[PDB]
Amino acid sequence: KVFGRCELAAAMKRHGLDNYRGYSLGNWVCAAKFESNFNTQATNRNTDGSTDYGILQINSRWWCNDGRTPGSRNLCNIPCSALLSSDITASVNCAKKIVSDGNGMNAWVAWRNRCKGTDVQAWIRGCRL
């Protein structure tokens, strides 16, 4: 599923991400934009041979099991394919563990490089939330 910006904002808010570990909704929408262009089916290969899955590009190295990432963990205890669903519940619940792990949203290199220190409120401008 390719979400609209405000559609994703509303889904992430309903799923409890607004100010989760202190990160305003705009941060999460900004992250999803630059990670996946709001596309739940987005997959990308990492240099280490791990893969990033779904709207928040969650990595098989640590968080999910894709059956082909040697010497990896499955800390969200999910198949990586669950992160590709039109339903963002698994992505959001896994993202909550990730951002809690000590590095906050710096775990998403695209958040650090493209969202951090920017006016992220712009990502939820005009949305009914």
Please report, as ranges, the residues that interact with Au ion according to CB under 5 A: 19, 120
Q: How far apart are CA 54 and CA 101, in angstroms?
A: 20
Known binding residue 101? Answer is yes
Least distance (Å) between residue 63 CB and Cl ion:
10
- Note if 35 is an active site residue: yes
Least distance (Å) between residue 15 CB and Na ion:
21
Report the residue number, 79 or 104, with the smaller CB distance to Cl ion: 79
Choosing among Na ion, Au ion, Cl ion, none, which partner's interface includes residue 77 (Cβ < 5 to 8 Å by kind)?
Answer: Cl ion
Find out whether 61 and 48 touch, Cβ atoms under 8 Å. Answer: yes
Q: Is 59 strand, coil or helix?
A: strand
Choosing among Na ion, Cl ion, Au ion, none, which partner's interface includes residue 30 (Cβ < 5 to 8 Å by kind)?
Answer: none
Q: Is 126 strand, coil or helix?
A: coil
Report the residue number, 8 or 78, with the smaller CB distance to Cl ion: 78
Across the beta sheet with 51-53, the strand order is 43-45, 51-53, 58-59
CA torsion angle 116 64 51 121 (round to 10): -20
Catalytic residue, candidates 7, 18, 35, 119: 35
Q: Does 77 participate in binding Cl ion (rule CB under 5 A)?
A: yes
Report the residue number, 34 or 127, with the smaller CB distance to Na ion: 34
- β-sheet bridge partners, residue 20: 23
Residues contributing to the site for Cl ion (CB under 5 A): 77-78
